[PDB]
Amino acid sequence: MQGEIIAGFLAPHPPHLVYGENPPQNEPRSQGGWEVLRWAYERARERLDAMKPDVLLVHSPHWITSVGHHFLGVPELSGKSVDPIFPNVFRYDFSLNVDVELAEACAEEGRKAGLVTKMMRNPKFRVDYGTITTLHLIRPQWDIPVVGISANNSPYYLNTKEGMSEMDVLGKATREAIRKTGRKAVLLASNTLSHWHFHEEPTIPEDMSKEYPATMAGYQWDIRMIELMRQGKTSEVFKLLPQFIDEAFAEVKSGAFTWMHAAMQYPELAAELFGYGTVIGTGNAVMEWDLRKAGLSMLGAAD
Amino acid sequence: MQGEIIAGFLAPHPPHLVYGENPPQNEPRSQGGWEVLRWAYERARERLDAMKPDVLLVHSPHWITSVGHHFLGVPELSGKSVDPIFPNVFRYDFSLNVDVELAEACAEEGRKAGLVTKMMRNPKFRVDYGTITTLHLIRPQWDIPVVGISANNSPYYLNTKEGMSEMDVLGKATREAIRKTGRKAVLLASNTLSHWHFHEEPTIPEDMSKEYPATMAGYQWDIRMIELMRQGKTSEVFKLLPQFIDEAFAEVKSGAFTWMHAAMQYPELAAELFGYGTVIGTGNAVMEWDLRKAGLSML
Amino acid sequence: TVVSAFLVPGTPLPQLKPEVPSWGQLAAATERAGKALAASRPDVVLVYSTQWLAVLDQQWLTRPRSEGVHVDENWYEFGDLAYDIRADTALAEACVTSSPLHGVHARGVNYDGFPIDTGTITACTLMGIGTDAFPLVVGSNNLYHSGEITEKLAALAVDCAKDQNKRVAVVGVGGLSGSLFREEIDPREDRIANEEDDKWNRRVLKLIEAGDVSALREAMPVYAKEARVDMGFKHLHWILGALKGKFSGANVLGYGPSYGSGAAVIEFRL
Amino acid sequence: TVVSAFLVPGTPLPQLKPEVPSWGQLAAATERAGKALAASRPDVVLVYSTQWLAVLDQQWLTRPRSEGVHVDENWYEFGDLAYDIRADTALAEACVTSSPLHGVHARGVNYDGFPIDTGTITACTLMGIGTDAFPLVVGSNNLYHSGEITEKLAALAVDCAKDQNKRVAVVGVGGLSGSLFREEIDPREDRIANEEDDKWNRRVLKLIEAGDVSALREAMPVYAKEARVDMGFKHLHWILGALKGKFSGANVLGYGPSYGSGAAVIEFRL
Ligand SMILES: N=C(C/C=C\C=O)C(=O)O
Ligand SMILES: N=c1ccccoc1=O
Ligand SMILES: [Cl-]
Ligand SMILES: [Fe+2]
Ligand SMILES: [Fe+2]
Ligand SMILES: [O-]
Known part of the structure; x- marks a missing residue:
């Protein structure tokens, strides 16, 4: 048995993308919307469909923890996820399955590496709206076990550098958990890029004639970062990540993007851009690092 | 023998997409722009690069002819293509080669099919900016011969249905020419979708913070139409086309899209969307019908 | 119009595990604040929570x-918070x-399953508010709003x-200082x-006891920065705005820790 | 300020192949308008071409x-149109x-290799304008502009x-009727x-000779629709605008075909 990281996805969680799809789980109904980003996710969906992984691991900015890094530790979780900011677009009934064994492995290896880690064992816990949105976007069937990871406070409470350093440690902790368990895993970094936004609610939100970048410079930052990734210049994206954080208010400050690449060992590998679009002005890219195609997917002999 | 129609691209001609790339042959220099559409074309470029075709045929809305359908008919054409509406973004020094044999075949086959056709034999003719833009967008190497076809007046001077019927016949004539000459060709319909537009650029044309659909209705029509052809419901696309043209003011009225599909025999085939985006508010999609993968390429 | 004013913790730890003595003291203090609230006979409770976030x-x-x-x-290991909140x-x-x-774009939120924050929930439970007798008017903590704007919302409310002839408890x-422990204790x-957080808490708590609004006002921004105060102390600004920058004094019914952070229950003497 | 006025054809067929008798007569007629323009001693020529399209x-x-x-x-077989246009x-x-x-967003166009239209070029060649002595001020046919807006652009110019103390030839x-043949002839x-186009062309040609602006304006829009007139006859609106909606008659120097379409040379009498 060998553990494997099949691929890593930049899988952002803007809820408007599920709103525009009108799945059965979502209560409110739209007249469509954001189909560029949505078509980008159909490309992502079919790539994941072919992977047939054992587990999806996701790192969400909207489960914020102060005391270390937390992992969903209950086998079955469910609920009604209502978005606090866009309740008119996202009220989603969900029911998911947690890969508790791997989640515990991750927590274990994280602790061993010097992070403080916790298992979430309250079965009435409501999984965060960011996690539910990304999972639906990449996998609407809800047929793959998940490992939900919290985004520890460190990047904001301490500083970007120290927080990123924790996220790096978390990532290599995750890789080690995956490889010891022998799981065939896909990674999901639930981060949008530039997060400058519209401050106003636009009556009929699906109106794509009123959807565009909030700023020029923020869009310019997104393109520059997106180009480097598809160029395979991974060390250059991470060297630029802090300045990108500050000037573009990028959601990767939350840590998912660093956690993912740390788990993949920062591969100098060309990423595929399924698509880029804006939602309320914020830049969102749906992308993939196919480690299996690069031959970098296999981690080592499991225990 | 074995004549082949490898694939058909919906390959629109916004000059802004070349402005954003800053190629050697385009004079003005941008700070980037329209990279979603440019990334869409990058995919289209790879697909064309792998096809290894003898020739690229293109039908352009910006070579307008009143008296029938015209074809490039001199071996080498070159010049400085300056866009009359957007001269600050597009001033492109070009040099192309024409597949004169095939162009003559198309004209003769159109003639035999009841269409009036003509060969353009004037060596100082300046190939239109739309043909030059589309060609650069899928093949910036300029190393594949082309057949430049004009867009006859009929859709506008007569009406949409009579115009589309002439494009249908032109498409069939084109198919026969490729079949008879044994060419392995790709088709290029140089049309944008919805053409409602802004009434000015914002001093900095590259400012993508000021780039979005002109109207909600136009965008919705575009999405509806390209989703349909993504489902391979070609018959349904062409039934909606006259209404789409009227309401979305779509450039497909020019006839390239009908010409391409007519030559392909309206394949009920799922098309691949490389990308949708907006330029000055107009809807532009870059798409492919891979007849080689569908086993429908051989004539 | 305002008959009562209180500041209470947003932490659920006093509710969830009162058998930890200092946590239990804070819960008891909140309960007492609720009794004082009730005795002032309000028709509505004007609530702002730092954890109710709008952008x-x-x-x-x-x-x-x-x-x-x-x-x-964060505190799921310590139990659940049942609620039945009336608006x-x-x-x-x-x-x-x-x-x-008053220059602030606003909407109502009326959705089944809308995520009411921990602070609003625990305050309702311990204070016995958000009932049919003491229904709530809850205004969000908009992350882009300053203290000055928060005061404007409170007065506005x-x-x-006053237009609807309703007595208001605010x-x-x-919380106070926000240096939460980053390991399990x-x-x-x-x-x-x-110690620095403790000194800052005690220093400002005494300014509030004395009703020294002038000194309190100039301390607040420095306090908020240096002691990492919950959300810039805008929950106090909410009280100040409702009181129109004036109160005679205060009674600190409890002051204690909440996983390293500071917390207090304060009854205001108008 | 305005010293002479002319309407001439945009088709290149008179210049390119004058050996065709009907096309030669129109070519000669345009040259005769050129001489009449020279005799009025203008400092600039104020030009509007139907084929110079703006959007x-x-x-x-x-x-x-x-x-x-x-x-x-369209007419590349009949030869080339060399030009040297001075502005x-x-x-x-x-x-x-x-x-x-005056309510119309406008821009200058100064680029090496800008596509000057066939109409402007053949008009310069045949009339002998666009020289250093008779330089052009050319304003585009914007497709979204009406006849009334076209007049506003002309009067504006x-x-x-007038401010620059310059004598202007307009x-x-x-073309006139636009029923171009759709096969080779x-x-x-x-x-x-x-006949219908001919009848119409002749009818409004007579209205112009008379100088009956009131009647002409009545006919123009109906004429434009029914005779498929080149670009809504806006190149006439340009003349009427430049003459402030008034003139006293005209001489039709030439009238004949251009591949089915009508074409004419009109000398205006101010
Ligand atoms: N990160 C995002 C981006 C865009 C819109 C809505 O969420 C978020 O707010 O969750
Ligand atoms: N079809 C087009 C759409 C948009 C802008 C410029 O180029 C075009 O001509
Ligand atoms: Cl809390
Ligand atoms: Fe987010
Ligand atoms: Fe076009
Ligand atoms: O166009």
Whole structure:
């Protein structure tokens, strides 16, 4: 048995993308919307469909923890996820399955590496709206076990550098958990890029004639970062990540993007851009690092 | 023998997409722009690069002819293509080669099919900016011969249905020419979708913070139409086309899209969307019908 | 129009595990604050919680009855928070309307399953508010709003209450110093994270006891920065705005730790 | 300010193949208009060509010197149209400035290799304008502009010329009826496509000779629809605008076919 990281996805969680799809789980109904980003996710969906992984691991900015890094530790979780900011677009009934064994492995290896880690064992816990949105976007069937990871406070409470350093440690902790368990895993970094936004609610939100970048410079930052990734210049994206954080208010400050690449060992590998679009002005890219195609997917002999 | 129609691209001609790339042959220099559409074309470029075709045929809305359908008919054409509406973004020094044999075949086959056709034999003719833009967008190497076809007046001077019927016949004539000459060709319909537009650029044309659909209705029509052809419901696309043209003011009225599909025999085939985006508010999609993968390429 | 004013913690730890003595003291203090609230006989409770976050427009809770079971995303190990929260829809809806006339775009939020924050929930439970007798008008903590704007929302809401002939109890929900421990501790050994946070808490708590609004006002921004105060202490600004920058003094019914952070229950003497 | 006025055809067929009798007569007639223009001693020639298409801003030619060889994309078989067009940058730039003050966003166009239209080129060649002595101020046919807006652009330009103390010759470049044949013909058998167009062309040609602006304006829009007139007859609106909606008669120097379409040379009497 060998553990494997099949691929890593930049899988952002803007809820408007599920709103525009009108799945059965979502209560409110739209007249469509954001189909560029949505078509980008159909490309992502079919790539994941072919992977047939054992587990999806996701790192969400909207489960914020102060005391270390937390992992969903209950086998079955469910609920009604209502978005606090866009309740008119996202009220989603969900029911998911947690890969508790791997989640515990991750927590274990994280602790061993010097992070403080916790298992979430309250079965009435409501999984965060960011996690539910990304999972639906990449996998609407809800047929793959998940490992939900919290985004520890460190990047904001301490500083970007120290927080990123924790996220790096978390990532290599995750890789080690995956490889010891022998799981065939896909990674999901639930981060949008530039997060400058519209401050106003636009009556009929699906109106794509009123959807565009909030700023020029923020869009310019997104393109520059997106180009480097598809160029395979991974060390250059991470060297630029802090300045990108500050000037573009990028959601990767939350840590998912660093956690993912740390788990993949920062591969100098060309990423595929399924698509880029804006939602309320914020830049969102749906992308993939196919480690299996690069031959970098296999981690080592499991225990 | 074995004549082949490898694939058909919906390959629109916004000059802004070349402005954003800053190629050697385009004079003005941008700070980037329209990279979603440019990334869409990058995919289209790879697909064309792998096809290894003898020739690229293109039908352009910006070579307008009143008296029938015209074809490039001199071996080498070159010049400085300056866009009359957007001269600050597009001033492109070009040099192309024409597949004169095939162009003559198309004209003769159109003639035999009841269409009036003509060969353009004037060596100082300046190939239109739309043909030059589309060609650069899928093949910036300029190393594949082309057949430049004009867009006859009929859709506008007569009406949409009579115009589309002439494009249908032109498409069939084109198919026969490729079949008879044994060419392995790709088709290029140089049309944008919805053409409602802004009434000015914002001093900095590259400012993508000021780039979005002109109207909600136009965008919705575009999405509806390209989703349909993504489902391979070609018959349904062409039934909606006259209404789409009227309401979305779509450039497909020019006839390239009908010409391409007519030559392909309206394949009920799922098309691949490389990308949708907006330029000055107009809807532009870059798409492919891979007849080689569908086993429908051989004539 | 304002008959009562209180500041109470947003932490659920006093509710969830009162058998930790200092946590239990804070819970007992909140309970007592609720009794004082009731004795002032308000028709509505004007609530602001630091954990009720808005980023677009100002939100005002407009659902008549919101009921559910909430599990705090940090303190889930310590139990569940059942709630049955009533809103004064007529008054909340008037605040939504009045807000743009005071330069703040606002909406109501009336959705089944809308995530009411931990602070609002624990305050309701311990203080016995958000009932049919003491319904709530909850205004959001918009992350882009300053203290000055928060004061404007509070006064704006008090005026709407005066128009509807309703006595108002004002409740601000949030912590003091915010240096939460970043490792797991024994809850019985909980204490203020550091001495500097403790001194700052005690210093400002005494300014509030004395009713020294002038000195309090100039201390607040420095305090908020240096002691990492919950959300810039805007929950106090909420009280100040409702009171129109004036109160005679205060009674600190409890001051204690909450996983390293500071927390207090304060009864204000108008 | 305005010293002469002309309407001439946009078709290149008279210039390119004058050996065809009907096309030669129109070519000769345009040259005769050229002489009449020279005799009025203008400082600039105020030009509007039906085939100079704009879509966004109104365009005004501001390049001091444009030269090249234009090949018409319909009539390339009959030869090449060499040109050396001189512009009055001062007056054209003044027209660019004045345009938005009259409600029309406008821009200058100064680029090496800008596609000057067939109409403007053949008009320069045959009339002998676009020289250093008779430089052009060319204003585009914007497709979204009506006849009334076209007049506003022309009068605007004439006012700019008044300020610069310049004698202006006005030239409208475009055809009459537009029922072009849709198959190839023997040029020697060219004629107006049908009687109806001929009847219409002749009817309004007579209205122009009389100087009956009131009646002409009544006919123009109906004429334009029914006889498929080149670009709504806006090249006439350009003349009427430049003459402030008034003139006293005209001489029709020539009238004949251009591949089914109607074409004419009109000398106006101010
Ligand atoms: N990160 C995002 C981006 C965009 C819109 C809505 O969420 C978020 O707010 O969750
Ligand atoms: N079809 C087009 C759409 C948009 C803008 C410029 O180029 C075009 O001509
Ligand atoms: Cl909390
Ligand atoms: Fe987010
Ligand atoms: Fe076009
Ligand atoms: O166009």
